[PDB]
Amino acid sequence: LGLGQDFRMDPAKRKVNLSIGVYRDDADQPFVLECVKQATLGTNMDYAPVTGIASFVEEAQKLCFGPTCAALRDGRIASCQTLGGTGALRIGGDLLNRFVANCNRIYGPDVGYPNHESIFAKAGMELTPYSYYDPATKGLNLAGMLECLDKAPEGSVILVHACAHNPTGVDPTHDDWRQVCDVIKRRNHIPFVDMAYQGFATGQLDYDAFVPRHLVDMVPNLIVAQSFSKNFGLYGHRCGALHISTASAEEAKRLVSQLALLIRPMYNNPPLYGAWVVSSILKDPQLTALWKKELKQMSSRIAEVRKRLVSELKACGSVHDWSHIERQVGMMAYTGLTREQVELLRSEYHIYMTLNGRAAVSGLNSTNVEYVSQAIHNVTK
Amino acid sequence: PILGLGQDFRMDPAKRKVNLSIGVYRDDADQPFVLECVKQATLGTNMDYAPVTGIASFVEEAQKLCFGPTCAALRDGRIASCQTLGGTGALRIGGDLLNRFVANCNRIYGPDVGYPNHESIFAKAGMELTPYSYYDPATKGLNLAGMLECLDKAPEGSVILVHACAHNPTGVDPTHDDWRQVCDVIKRRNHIPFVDMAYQGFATGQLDYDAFVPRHLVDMVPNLIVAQSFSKNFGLYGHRCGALHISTASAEEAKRLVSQLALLIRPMYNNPPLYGAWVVSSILKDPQLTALWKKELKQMSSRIAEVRKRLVSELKACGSVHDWSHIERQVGMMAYTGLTREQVELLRSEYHIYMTLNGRAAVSGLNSTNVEYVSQAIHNVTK
Numbered sequence: 177l178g179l180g181q182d183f184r185m186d187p188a189k190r191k192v193n194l195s196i197g198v199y200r201d202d203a204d205q206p207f208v209l210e211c212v213k214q215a216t217l218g219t220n221m222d223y224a225p226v227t228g229i230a231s232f233v234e235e236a237q238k239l240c241f242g243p244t245c246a247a248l249r250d251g252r253i254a255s256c257q258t259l260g261g262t263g264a265l266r267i268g269g270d271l272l273n274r275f276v277a278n279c280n281r282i283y284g285p286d287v288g289y290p291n292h293e294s295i296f297a298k299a300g301m302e303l304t305p306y307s308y309y310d311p312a313t314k315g316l317n318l319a320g321m322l323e324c325l326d327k328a329p330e331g332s333v334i335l336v337h338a339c340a341h342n343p344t345g346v347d348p349t350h351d352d353w354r355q356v357c358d359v360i361k362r363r364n365h366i367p368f369v370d371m372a373y374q375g376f377a378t379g380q381l382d383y384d385a386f387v388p389r390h391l392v393d394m395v396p397n398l399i400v401a402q403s404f405s406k407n408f409g410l411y412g413h414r415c416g417a418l419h420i421s422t423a424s425a426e427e428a429k430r431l432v433s434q435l436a437l438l439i440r441p442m443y444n445n446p447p448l449y450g451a452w453v454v455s456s457i458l459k460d461p462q463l464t465a466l467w468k469k470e471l472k473q474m475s476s477r478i479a480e481v482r483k484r485l486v487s488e489l490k491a492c493g494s495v496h497d498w499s500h501i502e503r504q505v506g507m508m509a510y511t512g513l514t515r516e517q518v519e520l521l522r523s524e525y526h527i528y529m530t531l532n533g534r535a536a537v538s539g540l541n542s543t544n545v546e547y548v549s550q551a552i553h554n555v556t557k
Numbered sequence: 558p559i560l561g562l563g564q565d566f567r568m569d570p571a572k573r574k575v576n577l578s579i580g581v582y583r584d585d586a587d588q589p590f591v592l593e594c595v596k597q598a599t600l601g602t603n604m605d606y607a608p609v610t611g612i613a614s615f616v617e618e619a620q621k622l623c624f625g626p627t628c629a630a631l632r633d634g635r636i637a638s639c640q641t642l643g644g645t646g647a648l649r650i651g652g653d654l655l656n657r658f659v660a661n662c663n664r665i666y667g668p669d670v671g672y673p674n675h676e677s678i679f680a681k682a683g684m685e686l687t688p689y690s691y692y693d694p695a696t697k698g699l700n701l702a703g704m705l706e707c708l709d710k711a712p713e714g715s716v717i718l719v720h721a722c723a724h725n726p727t728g729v730d731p732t733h734d735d736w737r738q739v740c741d742v743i744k745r746r747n748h749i750p751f752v753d754m755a756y757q758g759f760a761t762g763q764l765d766y767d768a769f770v771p772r773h774l775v776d777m778v779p780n781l782i783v784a785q786s787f788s789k790n791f792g793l794y795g796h797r798c799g800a801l802h803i804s805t806a807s808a809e810e811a812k813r814l815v816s817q818l819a820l821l822i823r824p825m826y827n828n829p830p831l832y833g834a835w836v837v838s839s840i841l842k843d844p845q846l847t848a849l850w851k852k853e854l855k856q857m858s859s860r861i862a863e864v865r866k867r868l869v870s871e872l873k874a875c876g877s878v879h880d881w882s883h884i885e886r887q888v889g890m891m892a893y894t895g896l897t898r899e900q901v902e903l904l905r906s907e908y909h910i911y912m913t914l915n916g917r918a919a920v921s922g923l924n925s926t927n928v929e930y931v932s933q934a935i936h937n938v939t940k
């Protein structure tokens with residue numbers, strides 16, 4: 177928030193904000209999807225049910241798990257609408273801490289999403305790290321991850337990013353996830369999937385939901401926190417869903433009613449607007465096909481600008497390796513710049529990143545990529 | 558369980574059925590009512606996240622609407638405020654904040670007959686809801702002397718929850734004279750008032766009068782909490798729009814609390830929904846929309862008070878010899894009818910009129926089309 181306010185107050189004409197949390201188009205503008213503009217809104221403003229607009233919840237389920245999913249056919253998954261991904265993470269955590277014995281710890285990647293620590297602390301669970309990011313390669317440390325998961329106490333809650341890891345952009349492959357998931361099954365761990373970027377990551381909805389789809393048949397309980405903030409661009413409308421797989425329809429009904437008991441004394445019932453939009457889009461074959469193509473356009477721009485930054489760096493004469501910038505996936509990139517280097521980019525060039533070298537690559541575009549590349553070279557050469 | 562009453566009502570095949578358990582306003586033709594001022598409000602151009610504490614312009618207008626145009630506390634910057642998920646979110650976030658400024662914060666006092674969700678809201682924030690005397694079932698009216706005595710004997714520095722107006726579920730409100738006495742006790746005993754104001758303007762059609770309680774208390778005590786809902790008064794229900802206000806001694810004190818509010822909001826839901834904030838901000842900043850809104854408020858509040866008054870006259874015209882003056886003395890959408898459990902059940906079984914077993918009637922479900930029938934049925938089961 178401080179980097180935002182400083183950027184805003186900075187008088188320089190050439191300034192660039194690479195600390196934002198939101199997608200931007202090539203003209204650095206906010207981007208309301210056409211499928212969203214074309215969506216049909218509700219006719220009244222009556223409160224939705226505590227657990228959300230039923231049609232929205234059902235489409236969220238199908239989008240997450242696929243329309244063929246056995247768990248979903250059998251009614252084994254307990255679901256509700258939530259205040260973005262954040263609300264799902266919180267409600268999920270509050271549910272675990274009430275109902276899992278000695279659920280006072282949750283394991284997440286060593287470099288991870290800032291709000292997770294406080295979300296789970298409010299739920300009475302201490303975020304503990306497992307090995308994940310390798311700063312030498314700005315890449316993955318699988319062996320370290322597998323080992324930490326294998327040695328975590330049986331029945332540990334394991335938090336994983338489904339794709340487009342935030343803030344590094346470092347994702348395991350599907351092959352890697354197969355190994356990770358086997359360890360989770362064998363150690364009877366409870367996987368908690370934060371899926372904030374389905375489809376936004378690679379432009380492929382199915383591929384991007386591999387983690388929860390693969391885990392759902394492997395473990396007794398899978399938790400998924402699903403955000404529609406980025407992939408429908410619905411940020412400030414606060415729209416997401418929480419999913420918890422269970423053994424049976426009857427068990428799922430009992431969990432939903434326990435979800436209601438957490439939701440009611442928090443905010444009573446959830447905001448309509450985002451639920452309308454997502455429900456309307458996913459039930460309309462024209463809006464759904466448009467949405468899919470818009471997702472690909474967002475995801476392709478991000479991957480193309482990453483690839484452009486790398487090629488511009490080479491054209492500027494950089495002799496350092498930037499291949500991590502193209503291997504990483506999604507909106508957030510751990511650049512591998514040092515604190516000193518980040519500070520000089522700010523001071524001399526008015527390019528704003530976090531001090532850990534995270535760059536929101538959505539803030540790069542046709543208009544500024546060349547300049548940012550030159551500056552990055554100048555400060556690393 | 559309004560939800561069960563809803564589902565049964567829907568599934569009931571009878572030709573003549575009436576739902577008096579609803580939580581929302583309806584017009585005379587039993588339709589949901591989106592205010593014209595709301596339909597005419599200017600919405601934002603993008604969907605980016607609002608700030609954790611809400612759209613600044615919204616929060617400032619919410620403050621002025623609550624406390625008025627000549628509030629010194631507001632001029633001096635002593636009030637810490639944020640946008641919330643309806644009145645519910647303000648109650649929860651407020652409660653979760655109390656231990657920043659209230660000592661030994663494990664209990665909160667509320668009226669003996671009160672808003673159902675309060676118990677659970679404050680239990681989640683670590684506080685046990687304890688009753689003070691308020692509703693008199695003999696008169697379906699107020700028991701002031703019992704309220705004053707409970708407040709006087711509550712331990713010093715107790716948190717006291719009060720409904721600003723249109724008490725839910727009974728419709729029994731103290732007068733301003735009564736509130737003066739209540740507020741003196743709260744000041745003298747160093748109690749901390751927590752005002753749930755869900756019906757400002759919706760209650761009587763007068764925004765200033767309806768906000769008397771928080772306006773009167775704000776100069777009398779070191780800390781006042783207000784949970785403000787825009788669900789009923791702007792008809793914004795399912796958009797989840799409200800604000801939370803906490804008075805303090807100084808701007809510096811307020812700044813600290815706002816930043817602590819942020820720390821509660823972020824790990825709960827990150828930041829609040831735009832739509833309702835846009836609407837309320839746009840209306841309150843436009844003199845033309847504000848005037849329209851004020852008129853529409855009066856229309857809503859007049860219909861509720863006229864249908865109460867009609868039920869009473871129809872009861873008399875049916876031949877009822879019982880007293881129903883409480884129905885007209887009560888204020889707002891909810892009325893404790895004084896019907897017994899047995900009587901509520903017979904209305905349901907014999908007449909297909911649905912209310913909660915406590916005799917609460919959502920009067921907004923009464924209109925030109927059904928008031929006569931409901932009156933006859935109420936007479937038949939009470940005579």
Ligand SMILES: [Cl-]
Nearest residue numbers: 350351383386
């Ligand atoms: Cl695969």
Ligand SMILES: [Cl-]
Nearest residue numbers: 481484541542
């Ligand atoms: Cl480009």
Ligand SMILES: [Cl-]
Nearest residue numbers: 584590856857
């Ligand atoms: Cl009306």
Ligand SMILES: [Cl-]
Nearest residue numbers: 733734766769
């Ligand atoms: Cl007065």
Ligand SMILES: [Cl-]
Nearest residue numbers: 864867924925
């Ligand atoms: Cl009438």
